[PDB]
Structure 1
């Protein structure tokens, strides 16, 4: 197995920091390395494995559709596509009844941005500092982290950033020339920072007052992650365009930009498109993913386990912890120092896999099927590494 690891390290572009281990299988919230070591996975492909590694229903839907049909364009209707369309819009506010399927989050946001420009006829985009929307140049233009943008300038203009949760800043920034505002209900990479009701209420109200669109990026908060089907169900606002991805396909690359009908209608024929977007394989996985989510009301586990996990985390007596925050099973532990060293030790010393969300924050995005025995061990592991 060491030849595959070394081949991956060698042939990779090098843009990633690859860990010294090879993960070969996964079931539920557990994964195994090539040596047989079993880990608690709080990474879950960056919030993709919400339904759990090896989810039976999704795996089955994938196997069956793979035998039937995988390549069929948007110009040629295919049953699983219509089924995904009606299954996803049925668990959403009736205003969001138009779907543009894609293959990633960045493509979902790229779709939202384009649909927003064609509909308003405006150009400006307003986003929040510490926000992440994707790496493709369109989505990168509204992604804050200067490190990620500077090297590739100039990007798409004009874009304006405002502090997250700053009601007045958002109010001043949104004008008659703003095509749309794009925000995460809970900032992910930005450090697991929940939006305030006042902030999202202001975003909704002012975008309407100015004729601008509101794009809510729930690529990471979606599919039960925050304790509710979708984070927005926590605040009581309905955006003009909703973008989803990650867990939407239960593992299969899948994304979607759901929008109001008058928004979709403004897009000229052939104004946008995608080869893989809407393909039967992803569509089938999507139907399965959503059907599992709804039958099991999976967001509940995050709603019950989230607070429970965060409480135990808080109880950890270490002066290195500044704050424990999050919503449901989207948790962040902010330290008063670099988190990277502790993430490496959780993996090798405790077989616990975690993420970062800024250099001093440890982020947890475990599958929502994860049990309490596993969450408790993660806690103990964190406590042990911090001591």
Structure 2
């Protein structure tokens, strides 16, 4: 039979309430549903589709590797995964890489590593993880425990112990929870799902200093801010603060499920044979696509084109706002942007987002108070503009 939106409510464990309409194909930043209706996509796969939909180069790298082999599992290395490791190593502070299949898997590896590193060098008691309220790090028991949203963790207790949460951008708060017993501090350089809130340069530099004083590993969760999103390859290059461990996923594979953990030689050393692993991680199909993604994103032209796009979005969202008075602030960095709703409209992000979709434009929320834009890094000027026209018309209807 045909497939209907009402099938989703009989067949899926109900953790999501997705859009009333169902996408069937797309190209760059346009996407179309089963009845031909056209959307401009500023969701961008939740900051994943860095190169837009059905990119011809990503396709050709896909079918080219797909016609050789897809997977053997990690008893055997492959050429694409090694080339992909080299690109990441050459391009970042990393000296070594582990590949996995999601952002949570990447953060599981990172927290595992910092645990074993501290145990091995200082002893079993040094196990403290400090993370930040409002953080999101994934949905595995360990990563959702690391996450700063107790409503996502509470139901699944007992939670792994020795995790504590400081207030984001609050140096003294973090300082109070970081002592010689801390093995890791995990922080997103911009909080993503928690509202598109960027770190300040002094906050990060202060976490770097605290980690050094207390021999703790600093982990940047760059799952959302990485691979071009901010206008440098990783947000840490923008802030100018270097972590011991950096995690990466989402846009890494331009839509193919991939993630990775980047590490210094010193940290890498501690993960000996059999101490972590993954069936699919490092397959050559993912690795061929991620390799092409990095080839295309990590160029001066694409990245400066991200800085430029930030200004086309912020200028236009600013003039929409003057006209309609929805938001108190447009914030973020590169093409991760949040519109903060005002006192009159607070908690209403999702209704604006639903209006947007009726008007032909896909936008995200980030908590009930922020409308979040995470479009393709190659969205064209014409796409930004027509998308923002439809968002204008939706703010129109919404504001009454």
TM-score for the superposition, normalised by structure 1: 0.96
> Matched residues in 1 for 2:2 and 2:368: separation?
30
CA deviations 1:61-101 (Å, max 9, x no partner) are 111111111111222121112111112211112xx111110
CA deviations 1:281-325 (Å, max 9, x no partner) are 111111111111134642222111102311221222233311110
Q: Is the 8 A contact 1:9 1:18 kept in 2?
A: no
SS state of the match for residue 25, structure 2? strand
SS state of the match for residue 282, structure 1? helix
CA deviations 1:149-202 (Å, max 9, x no partner) are 111122111111111100111222211111100111111001000100000000
Do structure 1's residue 320 and structure 2's residue 329 form an aligned pair? no
> Matched residues in 1 for 2:243 and 2:237: separation?
11
Equivalent residue, structure 2, for 1:380: 389
TM-score for the superposition, normalised by structure 2: 0.93
Do structure 1's residue 105 and structure 2's residue 103 form an aligned pair? yes
Equivalent residue, structure 1, for 2:309: 305
Equivalent residue, structure 1, for 2:122: none
Do structure 1's residue 218 and structure 2's residue 222 form an aligned pair? yes
Match of 1:240 among 241, 244, 248: 244
Match of 2:181 among 167, 177, 191: 177
Q: Is the 8 A contact 1:5 1:21 kept in 2?
A: yes
The count of residues paired between Structure 1 and Structure 2 equals 384
Runs of 4+ in 1 over 6 A off after TM superposition: none
Do structure 1's residue 269 and structure 2's residue 278 form an aligned pair? no
SS state of the match for residue 67, structure 2? helix
Equivalent residue, structure 2, for 1:119: 117
Deviation, structure 1 residue 6: 3.1
> Structure 1 stretch 173-182 or stretch 263-272: which is displaced more?
263-272
| RMSD of Structure 2 on Structure 1 (CA) | 1.4
Equivalent residue, structure 2, for 1:145: 149
Do structure 1's residue 88 and structure 2's residue 88 form an aligned pair? yes
Do structure 1's residue 353 and structure 2's residue 362 form an aligned pair? yes
> Matched residues in 2 for 1:253 and 1:77: separation?
18
SS state of the match for residue 375, structure 1? helix
Deviation, structure 1 residue 373: 2.4
SS state of the match for residue 99, structure 1? strand
Deviation, structure 1 residue 353: 0.4
Structure 1: runs of 5+ lacking an equivalent? none
Match of 1:135 among 130, 135, 139: 139
